[PDB]
Design a protein around this motif. Structure first.
Motif, PDB file in Angstrom:
ATOM      1  N   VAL A  13     -13.832  -0.040   2.920  1.00  0.00           N
ATOM      2  CA  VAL A  13     -12.644  -0.793   2.510  1.00  0.00           C
ATOM      3  C   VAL A  13     -11.345  -0.239   3.028  1.00  0.00           C
ATOM      4  N   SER A  14     -10.487  -1.129   3.529  1.00  0.00           N
ATOM      5  CA  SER A  14      -9.179  -0.762   4.070  1.00  0.00           C
ATOM      6  C   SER A  14      -8.392  -0.005   3.018  1.00  0.00           C
ATOM      7  N   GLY A  16      -6.220   1.204   0.410  1.00  0.00           N
ATOM      8  CA  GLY A  16      -5.197   0.551  -0.404  1.00  0.00           C
ATOM      9  C   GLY A  16      -5.663  -0.775  -0.974  1.00  0.00           C
ATOM     10  N   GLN A  17      -6.833  -1.242  -0.538  1.00  0.00           N
ATOM     11  CA  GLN A  17      -7.402  -2.505  -1.005  1.00  0.00           C
ATOM     12  C   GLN A  17      -8.493  -2.298  -2.041  1.00  0.00           C
ATOM     13  N   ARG A  18      -8.848  -3.372  -2.733  1.00  0.00           N
ATOM     14  CA  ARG A  18      -9.849  -3.340  -3.785  1.00  0.00           C
ATOM     15  C   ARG A  18     -11.232  -2.996  -3.291  1.00  0.00           C
ATOM     16  N   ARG A  65      -7.421   3.943 -11.487  1.00  0.00           N
ATOM     17  CA  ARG A  65      -7.770   2.905 -10.535  1.00  0.00           C
ATOM     18  C   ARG A  65      -9.225   2.487 -10.675  1.00  0.00           C
ATOM     19  N   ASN A  78     -14.880  -0.972 -10.304  1.00  0.00           N
ATOM     20  CA  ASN A  78     -13.733  -1.398  -9.516  1.00  0.00           C
ATOM     21  C   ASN A  78     -12.826  -0.206  -9.324  1.00  0.00           C
ATOM     22  N   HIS A  80      -9.544  -0.531  -7.376  1.00  0.00           N
ATOM     23  CA  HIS A  80      -8.656  -1.404  -6.578  1.00  0.00           C
ATOM     24  C   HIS A  80      -7.678  -0.682  -5.662  1.00  0.00           C
ATOM     25  N   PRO A  81      -6.642  -0.034  -6.213  1.00  0.00           N
ATOM     26  CA  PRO A  81      -5.781   0.644  -5.225  1.00  0.00           C
ATOM     27  C   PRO A  81      -6.619   1.806  -4.700  1.00  0.00           C
TER      28      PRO A  81
END
Lengths: 217, 138, 210
Positions: A13-14, A16-18, A65, A78, A80-81
């Motif tokens: 995951v990029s 900063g993304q969820r 997070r 989850n 997310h950030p």
């Protein structure tokens, strides 16, 4: 005996993304204080650490997070950030009955702007050569997409009789990778040659990166 | 030694937090979880205290879900008062009394004697549960 | 507060018992630090072994019960675990865990043709001193040992930056590893840098300066 299945086996995951990691239970594990599934995290070289206590319920000290959800059989973690240090393999566990079955594991990779290796070549130390062996080493430090192959050139001639490649885990601070590449020869083969070359091939580079040196007594 | 030993007891039905109807060695018998003070879901007065249902939801599952339930005698009297045997219920080796007293689902309680065998234990878990801000203490 | 120290690595021939352990700081064991043994085959496989409580009795996972045990030396603040009749199908790390938090750093056990082998540690300094750019990349290679692991630190640990210890590869029934250190171009060579390699399984400790 409930078998847990969490997927996908790899999650990239990029930064900063969820990131939602799923964990499916064979049987159902809920009630009226239950949702008897907890979540663990495991960095490489280290033991698992507790993240969430009862499906929801963040442990103490763990950042906000991370967030577990899930009812019946579908539970999800989850984060997310998502950040650099969130590189780890996150497991699910159930304690609705013994045996307490753990999860299959879900590896979390964080992606970023493409880095690029810093090549370093290391001729065989005298000491090693003293014992008739000769290991020419090539470190490829701090590059990003783990996709990188390295070739070995002995006086122009490509050699594959001895390549010992190894990759480090995804980095916790700048999220790059590194690799050690050793070519093992005999002191004989070695002394016969002169120009040893290591030319890294990686996404970020229109040609191969390369380093070398001229062998000497 | 010559202290205690548990005896297996097969479940029958979970009533309320501190109340478990368990098929004990022969004839069916009600038992009261020893030393805990877990809220109610029944009472013509009070009603359904917060953590009432929950506290019970704990107990029902711990025991209903256990593979081997052993019960434990307290040096006082198996006969409680309502009959309801007084005992230390275990679920697969675990103490059902402590679990509830640790997840903040019943505070340590009804101190008497010579029952106290597990006193400074329910005491330590509760403190911990107290240090934490869990369920009943939040 | 709360800590889980365990026994070190151990090569063992297939069939000759050993006992792992977990001394437990941040407590004493009585009111419980309920153990919950876990196994982890090399690769990725957390398998619940079983537990032990304050009461004394234990409870071993149905799967593999007997020939594996769990003891209690409380005064000497410890719970132990034995694997009788060890088999190759037993190599992995074993972590004790408290029944409400913390895990231990795990114990690794291996089980092969036996025969422990110390690594040949060879220093690797830039093939030609030339440098003169902000920083240097030194390294030292840990060739051909068995079993695992090795523990290469730099200057006793003083140096924890640019420090990449690359995983070991089973090169011909024998392992081999690598570690790189990117210390400022300013220090080296004037300033000493010494890669310290310790290899538990064989009482071997060796130090090489680049």
């Amino acid at each position: 005996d409930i078998v847990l299945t969490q997927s996908p086996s790899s999650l990239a995951v990029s930064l900063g993304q969820r990131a939602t990691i799923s964990c499916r239970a064979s049987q159902s594990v809920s009630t009226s204080s239950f949702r008897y599934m907890h979540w663990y995290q495991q960095k490489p070289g280290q033991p698992p650490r507790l993240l969430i206590k009862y499906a929801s319920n963040l442990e103490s000290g763990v950042p906000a997070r991370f967030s577990g959800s899930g009812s019946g059989t579908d539970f999800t973690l989850n984060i997310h950030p998502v950040e650099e240090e969130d590189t780890a393999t996150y497991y699910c566990q159930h304690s609705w009955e013994i045996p307490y079955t753990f999860g299959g594991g879900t590896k979390l990779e964080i992606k970023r702007a493409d880095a690029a290796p810093t090549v370093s070549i290391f001729p065989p130390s005298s000491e090693q050569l003293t014992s008739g062996g000769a290991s020419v080493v090539c470190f490829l430090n701090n590059f990003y997409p783990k996709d990188i192959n390295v070739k070995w050139k002995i006086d122009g001639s490509e050699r594959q009789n001895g390549v010992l490649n190894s990759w480090t885990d995804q980095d916790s601070k700048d999220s790059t990778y590194s690799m050690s590449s050793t070519l093992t020869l005999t002191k004989d083969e070695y002394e016969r040659h002169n120009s040893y070359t290591c030319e890294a091939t990686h996404k970020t580079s229109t040609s191969p990166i390369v380093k070398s040196f001229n062998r000497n007594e | 030694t010559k202290k205690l030993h548990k005896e297996p007891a097969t479940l029958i039905k979970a009533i309320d937090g501190d109340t478990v109807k368990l098929m004990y060695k022969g004839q069916p018998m009600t038992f009261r979880l020893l030393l805990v003070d877990t809220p109610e879901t029944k009472h013509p007065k009070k009603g359904v205290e917060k953590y009432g249902p929950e506290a019970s939801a704990f107990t029902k599952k711990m025991v209903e879900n256990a593979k081997k339930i052993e019960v434990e005698f307290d040096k006082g009297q198996r006969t409680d008062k309502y009959g309801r045997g007084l005992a230390y219920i275990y679920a697969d080796g675990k103490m059902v009394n402590e679990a509830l007293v640790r997840q903040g689902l019943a505070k340590v309680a009804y101190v008497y004697k010579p029952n106290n065998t597990h006193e400074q234990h329910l005491r330590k878990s509760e403190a911990q549960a107290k240090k934490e801000k869990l369920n009943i203490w939040s | 507060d709360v800590q889980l120290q365990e026994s070190g690595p151990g090569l063992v021939k297939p069939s000759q018992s050993l006992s792992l352990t977990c001394t437990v700081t941040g407590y004493s064991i009585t009111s419980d630090y309920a153990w919950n043994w876990i196994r982890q085959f090399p690769g990725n496989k957390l398998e619940w072994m079983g537990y032990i409580t304050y009461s004394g009795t234990t409870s071993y996972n149905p799967s593999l019960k007997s020939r594996i045990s769990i003891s209690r030396d409380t005064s000497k603040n410890q719970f132990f675990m034995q694997l009788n009749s060890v088999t190759t199908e037993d190599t992995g790390t074993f972590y004790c865990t408290r029944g409400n938090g913390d895990w231990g750093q795990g114990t690794t056990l291996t089980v092969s043709s036996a025969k422990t082998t110390p690594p040949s540690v060879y220093p690797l300094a830039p093939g030609s001193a030339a440098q003169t750019n902000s920083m240097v990349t030194l390294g030292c290679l840990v060739k051909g040992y068995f079993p695992e692991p090795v523990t290469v630190t730099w200057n006793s640990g003083s140096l924890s930056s640019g420090v990449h210890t690359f995983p070991a590869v089973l090169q011909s029934d024998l392992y081999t590893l690598s570690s790189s250190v990117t210390v400022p171009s300013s220090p080296r060579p004037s300033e000493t840098v010494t890669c310290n390699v310790a290899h538990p399984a064989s009482s071997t400790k060796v130090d090489k300066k680049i």
